[PDB]
Design an enzyme around this catalytic site. Sequence first.
Site, mmCIF file in Angstrom:
data_model
loop_
_atom_site.group_PDB
_atom_site.id
_atom_site.type_symbol
_atom_site.label_atom_id
_atom_site.label_comp_id
_atom_site.label_asym_id
_atom_site.label_seq_id
_atom_site.Cartn_x
_atom_site.Cartn_y
_atom_site.Cartn_z
ATOM 1 N N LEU A 1 53.762 -34.369 -16.290
ATOM 2 C CA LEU A 1 52.767 -33.459 -16.841
ATOM 3 C C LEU A 1 52.514 -33.646 -18.326
ATOM 4 O O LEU A 1 51.371 -33.498 -18.762
ATOM 5 C CB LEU A 1 53.182 -32.004 -16.589
ATOM 6 N N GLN B 1 56.970 -32.368 -28.599
ATOM 7 C CA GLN B 1 57.843 -32.668 -29.731
ATOM 8 C C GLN B 1 59.291 -32.309 -29.421
ATOM 9 O O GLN B 1 60.212 -33.056 -29.773
ATOM 10 C CB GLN B 1 57.350 -31.929 -30.979
ATOM 11 N N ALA C 1 60.448 -31.287 -26.119
ATOM 12 C CA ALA C 1 60.849 -31.449 -24.728
ATOM 13 C C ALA C 1 59.775 -32.231 -23.984
ATOM 14 O O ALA C 1 58.802 -32.708 -24.576
ATOM 15 C CB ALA C 1 61.105 -30.084 -24.084
ATOM 16 N N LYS D 1 60.558 -28.034 -17.906
ATOM 17 C CA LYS D 1 60.539 -28.504 -19.285
ATOM 18 C C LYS D 1 61.965 -28.841 -19.701
ATOM 19 O O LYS D 1 62.843 -27.976 -19.649
ATOM 20 C CB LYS D 1 59.942 -27.436 -20.202
ATOM 21 N N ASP E 1 52.024 -18.344 -32.401
ATOM 22 C CA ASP E 1 51.476 -19.666 -32.121
ATOM 23 C C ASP E 1 50.274 -19.561 -31.197
ATOM 24 O O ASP E 1 50.130 -20.337 -30.248
ATOM 25 C CB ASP E 1 52.532 -20.595 -31.527
HETATM 26 C C1 LIG Z 1 55.891 -25.531 -19.508
HETATM 27 C C2 LIG Z 1 54.899 -24.533 -18.898
HETATM 28 C C3 LIG Z 1 54.430 -23.497 -19.922
HETATM 29 C C4 LIG Z 1 53.679 -25.260 -18.154
HETATM 30 C C5 LIG Z 1 53.122 -24.860 -16.929
HETATM 31 N N1 LIG Z 1 52.108 -25.730 -16.623
HETATM 32 N N2 LIG Z 1 52.027 -26.673 -17.668
HETATM 33 C C6 LIG Z 1 51.186 -27.729 -17.814
HETATM 34 N N3 LIG Z 1 50.149 -28.012 -16.782
HETATM 35 C C7 LIG Z 1 49.318 -29.259 -16.898
HETATM 36 C C8 LIG Z 1 48.013 -28.990 -17.706
HETATM 37 C C9 LIG Z 1 47.988 -28.008 -18.698
HETATM 38 C C10 LIG Z 1 46.822 -27.772 -19.418
HETATM 39 C C11 LIG Z 1 45.684 -28.512 -19.146
HETATM 40 C C12 LIG Z 1 45.707 -29.489 -18.157
HETATM 41 C C13 LIG Z 1 46.875 -29.726 -17.438
HETATM 42 C C14 LIG Z 1 51.288 -28.529 -18.925
HETATM 43 C C15 LIG Z 1 52.257 -28.257 -19.885
HETATM 44 N N4 LIG Z 1 52.372 -29.092 -21.069
HETATM 45 C C16 LIG Z 1 53.428 -28.788 -22.083
HETATM 46 C C17 LIG Z 1 52.860 -27.993 -23.342
HETATM 47 C C18 LIG Z 1 51.861 -28.805 -24.023
HETATM 48 C C19 LIG Z 1 51.204 -28.049 -25.161
HETATM 49 N N5 LIG Z 1 50.680 -26.709 -24.741
HETATM 50 C C20 LIG Z 1 51.679 -25.909 -24.043
HETATM 51 C C21 LIG Z 1 52.289 -26.676 -22.889
HETATM 52 O O1 LIG Z 1 53.330 -25.892 -22.303
HETATM 53 N N6 LIG Z 1 53.073 -27.222 -19.722
HETATM 54 C C22 LIG Z 1 52.963 -26.406 -18.592
#
Ligand SMILES: CC(C)c1cnn2c(NCc3ccccc3)cc(NC[C@H]3CCNC[C@@H]3O)nc12
Lengths: 65, 280, 273
Positions: B7, B11, B13, B23, B110
């Site tokens: 996914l 920075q 994790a 994560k 944030d």
């Molecule tokens: C760790 C948790 C909060 C989580 C649940 N779904 N998801 C997805 N989904 C893939 C996605 C997200 C946004 C747009 C397209 C695809 C992506 C992702 N990326 C990690 C960070 C990146 C920066 N923004 C916050 C994210 O948690 N973290 C998460």
Amino acid sequence: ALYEYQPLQIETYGPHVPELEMLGRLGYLNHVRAASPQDLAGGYTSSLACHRALQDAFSGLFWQP
Amino acid sequence: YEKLDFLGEGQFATVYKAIVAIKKKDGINRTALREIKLLQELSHPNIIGLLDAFGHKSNISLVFDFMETNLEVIIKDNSLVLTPSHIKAYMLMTLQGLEYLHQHWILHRDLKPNNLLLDENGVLKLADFGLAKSFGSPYTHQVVTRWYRAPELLFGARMYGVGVDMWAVGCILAELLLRVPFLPGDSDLDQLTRIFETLGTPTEEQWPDMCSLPDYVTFKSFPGIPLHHIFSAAGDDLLDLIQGLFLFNPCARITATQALKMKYFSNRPGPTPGCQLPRP
Amino acid sequence: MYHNSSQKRHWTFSSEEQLARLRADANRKFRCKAVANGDPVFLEPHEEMTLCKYYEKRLLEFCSVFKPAMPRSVVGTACMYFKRFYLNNSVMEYHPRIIMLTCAFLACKVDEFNVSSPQFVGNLRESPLGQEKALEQILEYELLLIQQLNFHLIVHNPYRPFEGFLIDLKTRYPILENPEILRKTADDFLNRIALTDAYLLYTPSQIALTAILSSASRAGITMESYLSESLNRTCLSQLLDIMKSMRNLVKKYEPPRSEEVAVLKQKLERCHS
Ligand SMILES: CC(C)c1cnn2c(NCc3ccccc3)cc(NC[C@H]3CCNC[C@@H]3O)nc12
């Protein structure tokens, strides 16, 4: 479809805490440290501290495990 | 947990899709510890929930509900129009999440369109609690991405409150109405200059204690562009909400509960149901 | 907030009999695993409780002289971590000293008391090789400690409830002049309540109010009207019964004796060696 505000319904299991906007005129702020103007510049007020202290004092006082 | 897809990499994790999102010397990373300690004491439909945590040695892995997208992907997308109803719905979910968070004395610190994750059912949750901190005890000013940082923070505020979130919310609101970042500064000075050249240079009546911030320097006065000129197609209630969110005085800036009690959300049209929100 | 915290849900217990049951379960589980591994070396649960109390005092002493100055919240969190860990675990598997040092480490990190590892291990009164070894052990056991806490790291202490109660007494109880007199003695009572098992049996607000009312009664002042007027007869009776249980718990507490603790220490080292 119209939205309507409903306040959060969280049970505290204790005495009611007076609201933030009413603390000064009830005499609570007279017994807490006054925020310095530098604190007030950033949005810090003694009302928040007094409110948090009272909420901690009253949280779950009538609760049994 | 069987891994299904990669996914992303961060920075602190890296996140994979197992359906959940997982994560992954000083010891255990303090951002992970902060997320663990804060997401365990919270339970709201508009806050990302920690399902389970486990790790090995000095590393830990956190399990979260899988999130389809975030607000930044919606804003940057060009094939979907954002109606007033969609903006109101996103605003409402954000503000109820923030109201529940503030009631428990936590500052997110944030808030930005990428940190506002969206379910597959059109449910918005605040995420990335690595900078979140509890407030209400008598901090660093280098918090919040600069494009969404409040002038009090840019002026070096040590102690602050919910306002540092609300300004970001206002910024996000602006980014929903123009589809572009509202105040895209390059440095702290440039960000302050853009704030003052769009919204005017506040006097002592708009901010009684401006000159008390350690990083405060005097700026030349600016004829701030009127908000109805900036947000042309917005309405009167929306303009009042924007003005309340963008007030220079952090004490006078509207809180989340006060914003929810404004006429903008009560007025017609109502917020779009979550199941009907646009999908990238 | 406490009224929907994990401490109220999972870490507040109905009776100390259930606590003793958990401790005996831990002791017998370790005994069964050890005899499966292939005796007078084992310790009884009351001896384990004695050693746990001694090492809780050790953790207090470690936190009292720590530099930079450690806030009361961090110390309370560390002591609650120690109690929670040794509810479901035995001193004969994980040594209490490394566990209390790990408790202090984790409490410092969770509470946002930013201190680096070198200055934390510099607070130990040992050689630099010994300090490096202790740091290595602490880093080994940090994840185990977090797992044994079920990843519930936020601990609600009675200090902020105590401050809120004092504010409320100053505001709404003009019968009691100078409520700040109660600050000292009630503080003492809080310390004593920390040594007992009450942190797992009751709520922080109840502990704070019990300390305040005990201090007032010791001073020769009654505050029953505070509970009845300022603060339901069934609810008042429940609160009074909780306070009575608190005072009985504090009265029945006995400090560990030096000779018994020395015998238990050599026995525990024999178990570990
Ligand atoms: C760790 C948790 C909060 C989580 C649940 N779904 N998801 C997805 N989904 C893939 C996605 C997200 C946004 C747009 C397209 C695809 C992506 C992702 N990326 C990690 C960070 C990146 C920066 N923004 C916050 C994210 O948690 N973290 C998460």
